[PDB]
Write a protein that binds this ligand. Sequence first.
Ligand code: MG
Ligand code: ZN
Lengths: 160, 41, 49, 94, 177, 38, 97
Amino acid sequence: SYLPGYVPKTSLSSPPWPEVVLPDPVEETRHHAEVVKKVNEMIVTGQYGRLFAVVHFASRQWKVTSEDLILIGNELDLACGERIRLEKVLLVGADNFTLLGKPLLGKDLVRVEATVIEKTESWPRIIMRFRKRKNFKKKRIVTTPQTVLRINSIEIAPCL
Amino acid sequence: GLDVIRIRKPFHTDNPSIQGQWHPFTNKPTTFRGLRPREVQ
Amino acid sequence: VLADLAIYEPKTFKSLAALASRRRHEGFAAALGDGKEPEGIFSRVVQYH
Amino acid sequence: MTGKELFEMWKIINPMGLLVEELKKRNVSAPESRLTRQSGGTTALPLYFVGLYCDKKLIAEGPGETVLVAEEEAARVALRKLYGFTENRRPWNY
Amino acid sequence: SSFSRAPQQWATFARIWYLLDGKMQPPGKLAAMASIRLQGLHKPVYHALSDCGDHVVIMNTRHIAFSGNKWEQKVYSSHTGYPGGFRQVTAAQLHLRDPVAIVKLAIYGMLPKNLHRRTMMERLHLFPDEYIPEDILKNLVEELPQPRKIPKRLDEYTQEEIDAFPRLWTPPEDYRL
Amino acid sequence: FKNKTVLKKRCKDCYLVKRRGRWYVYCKTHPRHKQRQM
Amino acid sequence: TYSPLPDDYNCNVELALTSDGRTIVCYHPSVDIPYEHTKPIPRDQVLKTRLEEKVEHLEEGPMIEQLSKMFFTTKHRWYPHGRYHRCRKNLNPPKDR
RNA sequence: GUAAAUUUAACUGUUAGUCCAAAGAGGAACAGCUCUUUGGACACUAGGAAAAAACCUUGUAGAGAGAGUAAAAAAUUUAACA
Ligand SMILES: [Mg+2]
Ligand SMILES: [Zn+2]
């Protein structure tokens, strides 16, 4: 007995993409709790090494690790050799697991530590404007201030 | 003391990868007995 | 940073691709259902105030 | 010491010999080299991933332009993993 | 990965010998995926100055298929520069003369128009039939999936799907047919 | 044949046939009625 | 029974969401190449075994076409360059990691 | 709603003009034609329409190895008649 809505199996009676069934919500939330608890006990025991992070800083996103260097294109009103905490951590990850913020991770969960090690200027940049047959010719030299930060440590805490 | 010249690549890490740098055979499945395509065995 | 993860962290990029594909399947399921089913685990939006 | 590799600081000659000695003294069967992955092979730019297996279980993998150098690199990777000098190890605490 | 620097670099930048089949495939789709693989645009480590191309071995190029009437419509035009060198051959005539010229020309068109195109075309390998030389066969890795689906003519439908497909109309009993 | 854009039957014996991608008026009894669409 | 991606080439990926729903926890242990998926490793009576040292000197055309056939390039890579480019080349390039 | 306007003082330079949309005039209800009027743009930047003055998008200036966008890719296949 054919259902009122049956189509015979032709080339395009059915969608080309395979049918995808999604798991039921209750079993999926239990599975999420199990996976989160597993990753949490990995964090507790310490089965990780050489964490990396994606950190929002100075309108850019830097993929930093420990013992790293980054060059910020502005002055940071800090003395040299000064230890600061980078906070807007978009991502932290290791081998075998990563943690993803929505869009930012918890400050209790992850810390990034950086150190102002250099306050410098950039090499001179030339701005020249030339429009022809109109005697239009203009030159300028700019030197953008810069700050070199060394990323010291990336630490995570068991809070999932 | 370093030169005020052009700095390529405004970041410097010595350990760029932790999960292993991509090679072509990353994200490629293995085959029974490692057979090449159209191997007569 | 997405290209950086693609080159140097293939497992983190695979996890991101799996998350994106799972969100796609949630979107297709919601559009197909068209009713008031549960919104999905990863289709939830964290609101800020 | 920060940015350098173990066999960049400590030069060795026979990583396969060191590996079989370590596995013998920690009571592990002798490793077997197998061709996990292979590209080219007849050309002037081949690619060989050789895997070192122990009791049918992978312990190391290594790339090379020839089979012998791939096997040597796999031995070095095995030594690294067994000794704790892996690239993704925990960084030094300052 | 804990590789040494030189083996790690070699493993990242090594070349792969992809395999591809003709046999009722459209040469434009063949040429699109072959062009991606020849440029190296399938690699996340791609850069135009990094020479990251791969070898592509296309076989059964004699059995390609054109959608529509392209076998008679499509014209390949060339000019031997002597006055009167203007030659225009249809796609049928070009396929009958050279079994690999159509796929070669399609890939040559889709490759970028710079000085790297000839190097990429040297890494391209085309064979009209099932025969491949032995060294290339021992080089091959990853037969790629075909773009088309080979629409499966009437006589190789098995009886199970034949009688699973329902009957749409009842004919009169006195019709000759 | 005569090249025409509009084809017109001039007899009761003329017939329109589409051959080699073009319409034709063929007449067996009056061969002057042969017309070729262009 | 559902996986967003096939789980047999890089890592066994499992996605999870924390109880507050504020962060996404990914677990991806690497996959290992199976032993059965691998392949086993490839393998004058009276005088010396005199070392077979012949080096035939090919002229430029044959040498370049042999190199081009070997490395799958064109001839233009193998043709030489002038003193202007040779002395413009930087012989002490900068080196990062 | 906004912040400019008039007057007073002192002068230069521009006063050989192009296309587009609209209302017209002359010519052939020709012209990358000529003549007025209203309005744009160009003679200043950038992105698009293939190249590109005049069409479309967009203007106020720098550094960035960040992000959201604007305009932005042509579709069509036709003749049986008792
Ligand atoms: Mg004019
Ligand atoms: Zn007639």
